[PDB]
Design a binder for this molecule. Structure first.
Ligand SMILES: O=C1NCCc2[nH]c(-c3ccnc(-c4cnc5ccccc5c4)c3)cc21
Length: 273
């Protein structure tokens, strides 16, 4: 299953960094014989690294999941490492693409995005995998083109399960959906940004952002909600999202940082009350 020969036999590596995960850095690379641009995640070997490889491998091929192409077990700097070769997500991050629109971003488009993310979580939860770190850095597009596909990645905190772990994914969906609809995170629905958002959308968010994890919707309830299930019928209402993301771009790193912190807090064995 994992290739034991040198990854450089098959791939020409670059030093262009494409992203950073808890277990390793993500580099650009090129398949030596097809020329296809790909992404290489370098994981120094460990049980956590073996878990990530195992979980991403099982999830690879599922809807809206970044696909693994190859996995290599190599020696690097005298250390045993695992190299995950993934499809190159040349469209970049979800919210950067929205930010780079001027053009109308509609509530229907947010509903289609959320349905895509929910489809990925639905696949994972039906295979007893909870992601536990769904966040802007992990939501990527296959290309900069209009027909790009949104996919989830990074299984470094994934866990084979537990209703609590799955409810942390559902909380992530509510946070992402909140930002999708107004351009700032929930950490009420203030006017003017939320003035014209439908009642279905605000109802779904409140059901996902319950403080009590047992009160949060499951992914099945999420996918059956009319805002998701009937996402095509969702009003084409133009949102403030792109404009707000541009206006607040200097604070975007802080938004990502506190979401990362909130997600890590949900993963601790024992937390304060
Ligand atoms: O596992 C991860 N944890 C943290 C972030 C991340 N990005 C990736 C990743 C994977 C594949 N392609 C990319 C990628 C992202 N952004 C790009 C922008 C422009 C060109 C290529 C890009 C590739 C990123 C994986 C991970």
């Amino acid at each position: 299953e994992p290739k034991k020969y040198a990854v450089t036999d098959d791939y020409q590596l670059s030093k262009q960094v494409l992203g950073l995960g808890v277990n390793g850095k993500v580099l650009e690379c090129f398949h030596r014989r097809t020329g296809q641009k790909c992404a290489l995640k370098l994981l120094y070997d460990s049980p956590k690294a073996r878990q990530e490889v195992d979980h991403h491998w099982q999830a690879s091929g599922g809807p809206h999941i970044v696909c693994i192409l190859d996995v290599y077990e190599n020696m690097h700097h005298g250390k045993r490492c695992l190299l995950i070769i993934m499809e190159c997500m040349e469209g970049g991050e979800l919210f950067s693409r929205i930010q780079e629109r001027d053009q109308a971003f509609t509530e229907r488009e947010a509903a289609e995005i959320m349905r895509d993310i929910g489809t990925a979580i639905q696949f994972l939860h039906s295979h007893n995998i909870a992601h536990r770190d769904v966040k802007p850095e992990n939501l990527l597009y296959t290309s900069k083109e209009k027909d790009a596909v949104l996919k989830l990645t990074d299984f470094g905190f994934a866990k084979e399960t537990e209703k609590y772990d799955k409810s942390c994914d559902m909380w992530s969906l509510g946070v992402i959906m909140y930002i999708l609809l107004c351009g700032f995170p929930p950490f009420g629905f203030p006017n003017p940004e939320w003035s014209e958002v439908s009642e279905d959308a605000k109802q779904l968010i409140r059901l996902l952002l319950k403080t009590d994890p047992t009160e949060r919707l499951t992914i099945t309830q999420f996918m059956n909600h009319p805002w998701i299930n009937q996402s095509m019928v969702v009003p084409q209402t133009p949102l403030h999202t792109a404009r707000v993301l541009q206006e607040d771009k200097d604070h975007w790193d802080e938004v990502k940082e506190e979401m990362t912190s909130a997600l890590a807090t949900m993963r601790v064995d024992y937390d304060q009350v």
